[PDB]
Short mmCIF file of C-alpha atoms in Angstrom, two decimals:
data_model
loop_
_atom_site.label_atom_id
_atom_site.label_comp_id
_atom_site.label_asym_id
_atom_site.label_seq_id
_atom_site.Cartn_x
_atom_site.Cartn_y
_atom_site.Cartn_z
CA UNK W 1 -3.20 8.62 23.93
CA UNK W 2 -0.41 6.03 23.76
CA UNK W 3 -2.45 3.94 21.29
CA UNK W 4 -0.42 2.12 18.64
CA UNK W 5 -2.43 0.25 15.96
CA UNK W 6 -1.84 -3.49 15.85
CA UNK W 7 -2.53 -6.11 13.19
CA UNK W 8 -6.24 -6.87 12.92
CA UNK W 9 -7.37 -3.64 14.54
CA UNK W 10 -10.07 -1.65 12.82
CA UNK W 11 -9.35 2.08 13.17
CA UNK W 12 -10.92 5.28 11.93
CA UNK W 13 -8.50 6.97 9.54
CA UNK W 14 -8.44 9.84 7.03
CA UNK W 15 -7.55 8.38 3.64
CA UNK W 16 -7.34 11.95 2.34
CA UNK W 17 -4.84 13.15 1.09
CA UNK W 18 -4.98 10.86 -1.92
CA UNK W 19 -4.64 11.10 -5.70
CA UNK W 20 -7.12 10.25 -8.44
CA UNK W 21 -9.04 7.01 -7.91
CA UNK W 22 -7.20 6.20 -4.68
CA UNK W 23 -9.57 5.80 -1.77
CA UNK W 24 -10.15 9.01 0.16
CA UNK W 25 -12.18 10.25 3.10
CA UNK W 26 -12.44 9.38 6.77
CA UNK W 27 -13.47 5.77 7.18
CA UNK W 28 -12.52 2.56 9.00
CA UNK W 29 -9.31 0.77 8.07
CA UNK W 30 -8.10 -2.78 8.70
CA UNK W 31 -4.48 -2.75 9.96
CA UNK W 32 -2.25 -5.50 8.56
CA UNK W 33 1.18 -4.65 9.89
CA UNK W 34 2.07 -5.30 13.55
CA UNK W 35 2.36 -2.74 16.33
CA UNK W 36 6.11 -3.39 16.59
CA UNK W 37 6.56 -1.92 13.11
CA UNK W 38 3.79 0.66 13.43
CA UNK W 39 5.22 2.03 16.66
CA UNK W 40 8.84 2.29 15.55
CA UNK W 41 7.99 4.03 12.23
CA UNK W 42 4.78 5.96 12.77
CA UNK W 43 3.56 4.18 9.62
CA UNK W 44 1.32 1.19 9.04
CA UNK W 45 -0.02 -0.92 6.20
CA UNK W 46 -3.80 -0.82 6.24
CA UNK W 47 -6.84 -1.39 3.95
CA UNK W 48 -9.75 1.06 3.74
CA UNK W 49 -13.34 0.07 4.48
CA UNK W 50 -16.21 1.34 2.34
CA UNK W 51 -19.98 1.24 2.59
CA UNK W 52 -20.19 1.49 -1.22
CA UNK W 53 -19.60 -2.20 -1.81
CA UNK W 54 -19.64 -3.33 -5.44
CA UNK W 55 -19.79 -6.98 -4.35
CA UNK W 56 -16.53 -8.11 -5.95
CA UNK W 57 -14.35 -10.81 -4.38
CA UNK W 58 -11.62 -8.41 -3.25
CA UNK W 59 -14.18 -6.82 -0.89
CA UNK W 60 -14.13 -8.72 2.42
CA UNK W 61 -17.28 -8.42 4.50
CA UNK W 62 -17.16 -7.50 8.18
CA UNK W 63 -19.44 -9.52 10.50
CA UNK W 64 -22.33 -7.44 11.81
CA UNK W 65 -21.46 -7.95 15.48
CA UNK W 66 -18.35 -5.75 15.18
CA UNK W 67 -20.45 -2.62 14.76
CA UNK W 68 -18.43 -1.44 11.75
CA UNK W 69 -20.35 -0.92 8.52
CA UNK W 70 -18.98 -1.87 5.13
CA UNK W 71 -16.41 -4.09 3.44
CA UNK W 72 -12.60 -4.18 3.49
CA UNK W 73 -11.04 -3.24 0.14
CA UNK W 74 -8.24 -5.79 0.24
CA UNK W 75 -6.54 -4.50 -2.92
CA UNK W 76 -6.38 -0.89 -1.61
CA UNK W 77 -3.77 -1.53 1.09
CA UNK W 78 -1.27 1.23 1.56
CA UNK W 79 1.50 2.63 3.73
CA UNK W 80 -0.13 5.27 5.93
CA UNK W 81 1.11 7.77 8.51
CA UNK W 82 -1.47 6.87 11.13
CA UNK W 83 -0.78 9.83 13.37
CA UNK W 84 -1.08 12.42 10.59
CA UNK W 85 -4.29 10.72 9.41
CA UNK W 86 -5.56 10.59 13.02
CA UNK W 87 -6.10 6.88 13.64
CA UNK W 88 -8.61 6.09 16.39
CA UNK W 89 -9.28 2.52 17.49
CA UNK W 90 -12.73 1.22 16.62
CA UNK W 91 -12.79 -2.59 16.88
CA UNK W 92 -10.83 -5.78 16.22
CA UNK W 93 -11.49 -7.96 13.20
CA UNK W 94 -11.73 -11.74 13.63
CA UNK W 95 -8.79 -13.84 12.52
CA UNK W 96 -10.63 -15.24 9.49
CA UNK W 97 -11.30 -11.74 8.11
CA UNK W 98 -7.62 -10.86 8.53
CA UNK W 99 -6.56 -14.09 6.82
CA UNK W 100 -8.97 -13.59 3.92
CA UNK W 101 -7.78 -10.03 3.32
CA UNK W 102 -4.14 -11.13 3.46
CA UNK W 103 -4.72 -14.00 1.04
CA UNK W 104 -6.37 -11.74 -1.51
CA UNK W 105 -3.84 -8.92 -1.15
CA UNK W 106 -1.06 -11.49 -1.45
CA UNK W 107 -2.53 -12.64 -4.76
CA UNK W 108 -2.50 -9.03 -5.96
CA UNK W 109 1.12 -8.49 -4.91
CA UNK W 110 2.33 -11.61 -6.72
CA UNK W 111 3.29 -13.55 -3.60
CA UNK K 1 0.28 6.72 -24.46
CA UNK K 2 -1.23 3.24 -24.13
CA UNK K 3 1.28 2.14 -21.47
CA UNK K 4 -0.07 -0.09 -18.69
CA UNK K 5 2.45 -0.90 -15.91
CA UNK K 6 3.18 -4.57 -15.30
CA UNK K 7 4.70 -6.48 -12.39
CA UNK K 8 8.46 -5.97 -12.20
CA UNK K 9 8.46 -2.76 -14.23
CA UNK K 10 10.39 0.19 -12.86
CA UNK K 11 8.46 3.39 -13.55
CA UNK K 12 8.87 7.06 -12.81
CA UNK K 13 6.05 8.17 -10.51
CA UNK K 14 5.02 11.07 -8.28
CA UNK K 15 4.53 9.82 -4.73
CA UNK K 16 3.20 13.25 -3.85
CA UNK K 17 0.44 13.78 -2.62
CA UNK K 18 1.20 12.01 0.64
CA UNK K 19 0.84 12.65 4.38
CA UNK K 20 3.39 12.99 7.15
CA UNK K 21 6.11 10.35 7.12
CA UNK K 22 4.74 8.67 3.97
CA UNK K 23 7.17 8.62 1.04
CA UNK K 24 6.62 11.53 -1.34
CA UNK K 25 8.25 13.08 -4.37
CA UNK K 26 8.96 12.08 -7.95
CA UNK K 27 11.14 8.99 -8.14
CA UNK K 28 11.24 5.47 -9.58
CA UNK K 29 8.86 2.79 -8.34
CA UNK K 30 8.85 -0.99 -8.55
CA UNK K 31 5.45 -2.33 -9.68
CA UNK K 32 4.29 -5.49 -7.87
CA UNK K 33 0.74 -5.97 -9.17
CA UNK K 34 0.09 -7.37 -12.66
CA UNK K 35 -0.97 -5.42 -15.74
CA UNK K 36 -4.30 -7.28 -15.83
CA UNK K 37 -5.22 -5.65 -12.52
CA UNK K 38 -3.47 -2.35 -13.19
CA UNK K 39 -5.24 -1.94 -16.50
CA UNK K 40 -8.74 -2.72 -15.25
CA UNK K 41 -8.56 -0.52 -12.11
CA UNK K 42 -6.20 2.29 -13.01
CA UNK K 43 -4.50 1.48 -9.70
CA UNK K 44 -1.37 -0.49 -8.90
CA UNK K 45 0.64 -1.66 -5.93
CA UNK K 46 4.17 -0.26 -6.15
CA UNK K 47 7.15 0.47 -3.87
CA UNK K 48 9.11 3.74 -4.09
CA UNK K 49 12.81 3.85 -4.93
CA UNK K 50 15.42 6.17 -3.43
CA UNK K 51 18.98 6.66 -4.61
CA UNK K 52 20.00 7.53 -1.01
CA UNK K 53 19.74 4.36 1.08
CA UNK K 54 19.28 4.61 4.85
CA UNK K 55 20.88 1.16 5.13
CA UNK K 56 18.03 -0.80 6.70
CA UNK K 57 17.15 -4.42 5.77
CA UNK K 58 13.83 -3.75 4.01
CA UNK K 59 15.74 -1.76 1.37
CA UNK K 60 16.42 -3.88 -1.73
CA UNK K 61 19.35 -2.78 -3.89
CA UNK K 62 18.85 -2.44 -7.63
CA UNK K 63 21.64 -3.84 -9.82
CA UNK K 64 23.69 -1.23 -11.65
CA UNK K 65 22.99 -2.32 -15.24
CA UNK K 66 19.33 -1.21 -15.12
CA UNK K 67 19.81 2.55 -15.48
CA UNK K 68 17.70 3.04 -12.33
CA UNK K 69 19.95 3.52 -9.32
CA UNK K 70 19.06 3.01 -5.70
CA UNK K 71 17.07 0.82 -3.35
CA UNK K 72 13.45 -0.28 -3.37
CA UNK K 73 11.73 0.62 -0.09
CA UNK K 74 9.85 -2.63 0.34
CA UNK K 75 7.89 -1.49 3.39
CA UNK K 76 6.52 1.60 1.60
CA UNK K 77 4.36 -0.25 -0.94
CA UNK K 78 1.00 1.32 -1.59
CA UNK K 79 -2.04 1.42 -3.83
CA UNK K 80 -1.38 4.20 -6.38
CA UNK K 81 -3.38 5.79 -9.19
CA UNK K 82 -0.65 5.45 -11.79
CA UNK K 83 -2.31 7.74 -14.32
CA UNK K 84 -2.84 10.59 -11.87
CA UNK K 85 0.76 10.16 -10.64
CA UNK K 86 1.99 9.94 -14.27
CA UNK K 87 3.77 6.58 -14.46
CA UNK K 88 6.43 6.32 -17.18
CA UNK K 89 8.27 3.05 -17.84
CA UNK K 90 12.02 3.17 -17.21
CA UNK K 91 13.27 -0.42 -16.93
CA UNK K 92 12.43 -3.94 -15.79
CA UNK K 93 13.71 -5.34 -12.50
CA UNK K 94 15.20 -8.85 -12.46
CA UNK K 95 13.29 -11.71 -10.90
CA UNK K 96 15.46 -11.93 -7.80
CA UNK K 97 14.85 -8.26 -6.93
CA UNK K 98 11.09 -8.77 -7.31
CA UNK K 99 11.15 -11.91 -5.17
CA UNK K 100 13.19 -10.24 -2.41
CA UNK K 101 10.87 -7.22 -2.30
CA UNK K 102 7.82 -9.48 -2.14
CA UNK K 103 9.30 -11.61 0.64
CA UNK K 104 10.08 -8.56 2.75
CA UNK K 105 6.74 -6.84 2.11
CA UNK K 106 4.94 -10.11 2.83
CA UNK K 107 6.55 -10.28 6.26
CA UNK K 108 5.45 -6.70 6.96
CA UNK K 109 1.88 -7.54 5.95
CA UNK K 110 1.78 -10.61 8.19
CA UNK K 111 1.55 -13.14 5.38
CA UNK K 112 2.71 -16.79 5.57
#
C-alpha cells in the first residue's frame, strides 16, 4: 500500500500507546495535516473519533452518510506516526466538518 | 502540588509513551492551550523542546535568558495528559515565541 493520509481523510488508527486520560484504542481519526507533510515525515496531525459522545461543543458530528460512527474530538488532536499506528483509509469528511474541527482546535491552541 | 499549566509556560514533561517517529523522552514543552482548559480536562496541547536542533523551519528558537535552552518543535504539538506525564513549570516563553509557534503549527493544521 502506497497510501498516504491527506487532510480531511478519515482513517482507522490505533491511538494506543497513550498515557493517562489521552484517547486510546483503535478508532477512526480525522486527518488535519496535508499529505505533503504526512508523506515526508511519516507523521500526521489527526483527531480521534469516539462513539462515547458527551455532547459538548468540541465534539464535531459526522454526517450519517459517511458510514463512520461517532464524533470528532477536536481538542484531542495530536502528532501521530500513522504507519506505526497502522492507518487505513476509511472515508473523507466534508469540508464543513474539517472547517468546524479546525476552528475549534484553533480556539484551543490560542490562534 | 496545585500547579495547572497555562499557555506560554515552559514545563518539564515526559513525552514517553509514544509510537514510532513521535517525539519521546523527558524534555521541556511549550504549552499552547490555556489553564482554563488544562485544569478542567487534565489534558493540554503542548510542543516538545529539544536542545539539539535539526535546523528546519518549524523549529522555533528559545531566547537564552529563559534557562530553557533549545528549539520548540512546532509540528510535534499534541494532546497530553500533563499529570500522567508529570509536568513541572520551568519558565515562561515570551509572546513572540508563542506567536511564531502558533503560526507555524496553524499552517501545519491547515488553518487560515
